[PDB]
Amino acid sequence: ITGTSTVGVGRGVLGDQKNINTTYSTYYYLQDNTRGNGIFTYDAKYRTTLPGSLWADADNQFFASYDAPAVDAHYYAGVTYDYYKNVHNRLSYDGNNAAIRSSVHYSQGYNNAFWNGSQMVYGDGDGQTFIPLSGGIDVVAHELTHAVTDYTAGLIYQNESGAINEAISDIFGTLVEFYANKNPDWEIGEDVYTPGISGDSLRSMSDPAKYGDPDHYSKRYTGTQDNGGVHINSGIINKAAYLISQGGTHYGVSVVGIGRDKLGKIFYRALTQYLTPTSNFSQLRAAAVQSATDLYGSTSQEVASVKQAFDAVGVK
Numbered sequence: 001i002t003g004t005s006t007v008g009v010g011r012g013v014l015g016d017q018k019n020i021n022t023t024y025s026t027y028y029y030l031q032d033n034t035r036g037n038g039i040f041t042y043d044a045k046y047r048t049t050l051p052g053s054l055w056a057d058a059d060n061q062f063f064a065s066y067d068a069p070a071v072d073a074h075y076y077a078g079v080t081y082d083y084y085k086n087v088h089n090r091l092s093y094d095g096n097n098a099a100i101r102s103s104v105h106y107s108q109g110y111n112n113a114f115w116n117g118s119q120m121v122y123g124d125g126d127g128q129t130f131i132p133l134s135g136g137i138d139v140v141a142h143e144l145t146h147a148v149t150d151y152t153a154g155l156i157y158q159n160e161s162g163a164i165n166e167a168i169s170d171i172f173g174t175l176v177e178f179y180a181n182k183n184p185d186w187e188i189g190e191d192v193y194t195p196g197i198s199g200d201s202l203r204s205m206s207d208p209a210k211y212g213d214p215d216h217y218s219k220r221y222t223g224t225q226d227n228g229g230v231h232i233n234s235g236i237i238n239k240a241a242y243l244i245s246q247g248g249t250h251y252g253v254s255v256v257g258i259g260r261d262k263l264g265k266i267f268y269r270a271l272t273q274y275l276t277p278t279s280n281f282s283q284l285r286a287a288a289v290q291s292a293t294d295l296y297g298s299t300s301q302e303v304a305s306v307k308q309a310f311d312a313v314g315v316k
């Protein structure tokens with residue numbers, strides 16, 4: 001909408017107060033004009049019609065319980081935009097500052113979030129498995145990263161290419177969580193998962209097997225559920241990424257860690273310069289080796305550690 005940029009204040013899903021960029025024209029709208037061609041947050045009103053209504057508020061204060069998922073979807077989209085711009089010199093998901101749109105309050109009891117080809121969408125959860133999913137900064141960044149992938153490598157959402165697609169979203173979701181630096185970890189979705197159980201998460205990158213996901217190519221799933229296990233076999237690549245950053249010895253193979261920033265540079269370059277819609281795990285290894293070679297040199301520790309990490313997870 002046309003209006004003037006304003007700054008509202010509200011409370012997110014976890015009860016924390018934050019400022020949000022809004023736009024005033026009769027109402028205050030969740031429209032942040034400070035980033036690219038805008039970040040826009042919509043109310044889906046418990047229905048499945050998208051996007052719903054651009055979020056309108058009478059007084060620029062967002063402390064109602066119903067407001068909390070919108071506050072966080074809007075704010076964390078801003079953090080994710082900032083990460084891509086400041087760290088990778090990428091302007092929004094398409095590289096040309098496309099408007100970023102999210103809808104909250106999607107459906108009833110909806111234990112998921114997704115990119116629908118055009119926008120982000122967040123359920124409220126059923127209160128048992130999830131609380132409103134925009135409360136997780138790693139979740140928000142996971143979803144926006146699907147848009148980045150779709151505009152760049154274009155990894156098809158099935159089988160190995162789809163597991164790479166998933167892992168890319170978990171990797172950058174985690175790197176955005178570290179960027180914001182509030183309780184960062186290598187777990188996925190812990191802030192919105194199972195409010196009655198402490199210490200768990202949807203997936204672990206540091207130890208995928210904690211939740212039954214494979215941590216070695218020999219343990220990959222090859223059935224048809226979950227688009228050929230895209231959220232399962234992602235564990236193999238998540239483990240490799242964790243090892244590249246943090247190091248460790250895994251199935252007897254020792255990996256020298258090189259840290260998160262270099263992990264992110266290597267995988268961002270792989271995603272945007274080398275991967276294709278049909279890349280498999282072996283082709284990802286080659287892309288990551290080439291990316292590290294471009295950035296750090298063929299004889300570098302970074303290249304050697306990429307090779308060790310993929311060796312550790314059984315990917316040649």
Ligand SMILES: CC(C)C[C@H](NP(=O)(O)CNC(=O)OCc1ccccc1)C(=O)NCCCCN
Nearest residue numbers: 111112113114115116117139142143157189231
């Ligand atoms: C980070 C997690 C909290 C959320 C994360 N969701 P996602 O983005 O991977 C789901 N996208 C998805 O299907 O895209 C395909 C698609 C394409 C066009 C249109 C629509 C859908 C996820 O791990 N879900 C699995 C666990 C959900 C437990 N009930």
Ligand SMILES: [Ca+2]
Nearest residue numbers: 057059061062
């Ligand atoms: Ca209000």
Ligand SMILES: [Ca+2]
Nearest residue numbers: 182183184185
């Ligand atoms: Ca965390």
Ligand SMILES: [Ca+2]
Nearest residue numbers: 138187188189
């Ligand atoms: Ca996390």
Ligand SMILES: [Ca+2]
Nearest residue numbers: 193194195197
């Ligand atoms: Ca929990």
Ligand SMILES: [Zn+2]
Nearest residue numbers: 142146166169
């Ligand atoms: Zn995903």
